[PDB]
Amino acid sequence: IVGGYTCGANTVPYQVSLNSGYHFCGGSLINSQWVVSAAHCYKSGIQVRLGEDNINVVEGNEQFISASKSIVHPSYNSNTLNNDIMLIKLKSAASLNSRVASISLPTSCASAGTQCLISGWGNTKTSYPDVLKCLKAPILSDSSCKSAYPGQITSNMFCAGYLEGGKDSCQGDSGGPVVCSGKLQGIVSWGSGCAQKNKPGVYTKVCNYVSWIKQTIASN
Numbered sequence: 001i002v003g004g005y006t007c008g009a010n011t012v013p014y015q016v017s018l019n020s021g022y023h024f025c026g027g028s029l030i031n032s033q034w035v036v037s038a039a040h041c042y043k044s045g046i047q048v049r050l051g052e053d054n055i056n057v058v059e060g061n062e063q064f065i066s067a068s069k070s071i072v073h074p075s076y077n078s079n080t081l082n083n084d085i086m087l088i089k090l091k092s093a094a095s096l097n098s099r100v101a102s103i104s105l106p107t108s109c110a111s112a113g114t115q116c117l118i119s120g121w122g123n124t125k126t127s128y129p130d131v132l133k134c135l136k137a138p139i140l141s142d143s144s145c146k147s148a149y150p151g152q153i154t155s156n157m158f159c160a161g162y163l164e165g166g167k168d169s170c171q172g173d174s175g176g177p178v179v180c181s182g183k184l185q186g187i188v189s190w191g192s193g194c195a196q197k198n199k200p201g202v203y204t205k206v207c208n209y210v211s212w213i214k215q216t217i218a219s220n
């Protein structure tokens with residue numbers, strides 16, 4: 001997160017760190033047994049770390065739970081990054097409390113200008129901060145999104161952030177949450193680097209995937 005601020009400890013209780021030796025991506029807890037993240041974050045082995053703030057210090061309120069299943073969207077395209085979404089089933093249910101909580105899936109898509117909260121331990125320009133970073137940022141119109149990335153924005157992508165630059169999610173934030181009005185509307189997906197002028201962050205449009213997410217949870 002560039003141009004952000006340090007989150008209050010555990011103030012983002014749906015935020016998880018994906019770890020395979022070190023932190024490599026974010027995710028969002030959306031069910032006691034399931035985390036949603038980005039398909040481009042895929043690894044065959046993943047430890048989910050919930051209740052984190054300082055990922056480099058054992059504070060005590062963390063829950064470390066290995067991934068038992070990892071399901072990438074069947075129509076995920078690694079070129080266009082269309083359908084950049086992945087579900088992780090936890091080996092055991094996360095225990096929900098004040099510091100570890102589910103975030104609601106969208107009830108509808110979000111209108112342009114809706115204020116969101118983006119968070120992660122990604123780059124802020126060894127590279128990554130210890131402490132979870134936060135950024136407030138608005139949903140941009142589909143127009144501003146498409147203008148910025150001609151021919152590259154599908155119906156499954158939203159831009160969230162600032163055309164001006166200096167405020168954006170970066171590598172390491174990938175797979176992490178964009179939450180607007182209590183609902184997970186975006187998953188950190190891609191961009192042209194980060195925080196550059198007229199290159200706002202591009203995010204998987206979660207409001208298109210509620211039925212696929214529910215189906216996947218129901219089946220597995």
Ligand SMILES: [Ca+2]
Pocket residue numbers: 052053054055056057058059060062
């Ligand atoms: Ca910790």
Ligand code: NA
Pocket residue numbers: 007008009010011012051052053054132
């Ligand atoms: Na935290």
